[PDB]
Ligand binder design. Structure first.
Ligand code: 8PV
Length: 457
């Protein structure tokens, strides 16, 4: 069930289609992964059209004593970094190269076979109509109120995914349409930018009787389950999870989304032990209007979320992180003392209770927790103006390189062990394919091999 590119004859209609939408510009095509890759290859076949690139690639062949794959790597790693797609002496020279690249070389690209190939891939993208036959479904890996989550392979590329499959009957029966759709909106806002610390969405589709989210596969269970098996974590182990989560929150806050349900059961591990924030059903967009409602899990909600009538924003999440990091070190939320099932008492504690930190805690850790758990939003870490940057700058993360955190170069502390009619109208607009995600999927699976096969035909 693999991919078949349409024949080159679609070029005229496709080129015109995109021109009418003003999408045949350097900024539009170059910022797409598949556009970048094909434009890169065009440049590399016709280096003469970019004066500085000829001499450079002539010198590298002599320096490395080569026998094509290097050309691509050097373009991606070195050339792109130096040109970027604090004042620099070479600024006018960077502009000259880039102006030639986005003008005369782009134009010649538009007129070449390589743009015909971009039109073919782009046509396939606009023809995505996902059903359950496009996936091969394996075992259950998660359960919830309206449905469950399965492991699966998408047939045409072979990429493994998680398929969150909500049952429409059960949604109707429990009167939770608004929240199922909220998850779809929230995922849509968050799943751009390619972030490694959030369980993002690639596709959404629906059947007669099921809503389906295709999501990043997280195979290794959640931090709640692992905390009960491992026991509490040291400061060194918790730092790893904290750093990765702080970057997940930064990403969400940058897109004006408060998450509101930050807690260990909502932190999933992959098979390597790296983590992502999952379940955005309770998250809220705060770009237009700030939410007031008390939403979350009781030992994890911030004072401003609980206080009656007070508006709140991303500030909530930093407090929730404070509660959650304490839970990883101590086995319980700070404001749930003796495994209480008294929600009123937990909330009173959240506002009034002085959190007693043991001597074993380092002063650096105390600084962090006392910062995150500030009850006034005006004095809390993360809320003084500069967001996640203020939290990264804590002395608990003194020795971390945040670039390496982002790139996932730090070793994880725990490696999981291997092994009616009107109602259907509500779910129109539910189908979505996030372009960036599909292109990334194609790039990393079958792009090269389909291009070679097509080139032969
Ligand atoms: O509708 C739901 N929840 C609604 C709700 C929430 C809170 C209280 C009342 C109702 C619902 C439905 C299926 C599952 C889950 N949560 C588990 C989960 N979420 N993502 C994964 C996952 C597993 C592997 N890989 C990637 C993702 N697993 C919640």
């Amino acid at each position: 069930k693999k991919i078949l590119l349409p024949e080159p004859s679609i070029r005229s209609v496709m080129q015109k289609y995109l021109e009418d939408r003003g999408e045949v510009t350097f900024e539009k095509i170059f910022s797409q992964k598949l556009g970048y890759l094909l434009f890169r290859d065009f440049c590399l076949n016709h280096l003469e059209e970019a004066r500085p690139l000829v001499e450079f690639y002539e010198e590298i062949k002599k320096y490395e004593k080569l026998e094509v794959a290097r050309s691509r790597e050097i373009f991606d790693s070195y050339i792109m970094k130096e040109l970027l797609a604090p004042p620099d002496l070479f600024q006018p020279y960077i502009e000259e190269i880039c102006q030639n690249l986005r003008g005369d070389v782009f134009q010649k690209f538009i007129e070449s076979d390589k743009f015909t190939r971009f039109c073919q891939w782009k046509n396939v993208e606009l023809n995505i109509h996902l059903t359950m036959n496009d996936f091969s479904v394996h075992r259950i890996i998660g359960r919830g109120g309206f449905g469950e989550v399965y492991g699966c392979r998408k047939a045409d590329t072979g990429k493994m995914y998680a398929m969150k499959c909500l049952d429409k009957k059960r949604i109707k029966m429990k009167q939770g349409e608004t929240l199922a759709l909220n998850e779809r909106i929230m995922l849509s806002l968050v799943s751009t930018g390619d972030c490694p610390f959030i369980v993002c969405m690639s596709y959404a589709f629906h059947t007669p009787d099921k809503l389906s989210f295709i999501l990043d596969l997280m195979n290794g269970g959640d931090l709640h389950y692992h905390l009960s098996q491992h026991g509490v974590f040291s400061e060194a182990d918790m730092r790893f999870y904290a750093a990765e989560i702080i970057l997940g929150l930064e990403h969400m806050h940058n897109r004006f989304v408060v998450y509101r349900d930050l807690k260990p059961a909502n932190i999933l591990l992959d098979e390597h032990g790296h983590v992502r924030i999952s379940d955005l059903g309770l998250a809220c967009d705060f770009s237009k209007k700030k939410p007031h409602a008390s939403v979350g899990t009781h030992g994890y909600m911030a004072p401003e979320v609980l206080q009656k009538g007070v508006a709140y924003d991303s500030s909530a999440d930093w407090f929730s992180l404070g509660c959650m990091l304490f839970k990883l070190l101590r086995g319980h939320s700070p404001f749930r003392q003796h495994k209480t099932k008294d929600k009123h008492e937990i909330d009173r504690m959240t506002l009034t209770m002085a959190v007693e930190l043991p001597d074993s805690f380092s002063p650096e850790l105390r600084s962090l927790l006392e910062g995150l758990l500030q009850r006034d939003v005006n004095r809390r870490l993360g809320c003084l103006g500069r967001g996640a940057q203020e939290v990264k700058e804590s002395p608990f993360f003194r020795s971390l390189d945040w670039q390496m955190v982002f790139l996932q170069k730090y070793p994880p502390p725990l490696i999981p062990p291997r092994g009616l009619d009107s109602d259907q109208e509500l779910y129109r607009n539910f189908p979505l394919t996030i372009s960036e995600r599909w292109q990334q999927e194609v790039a990393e699976t079958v792009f090269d091999t389909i291009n070679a096969e097509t080139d032969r035909l």
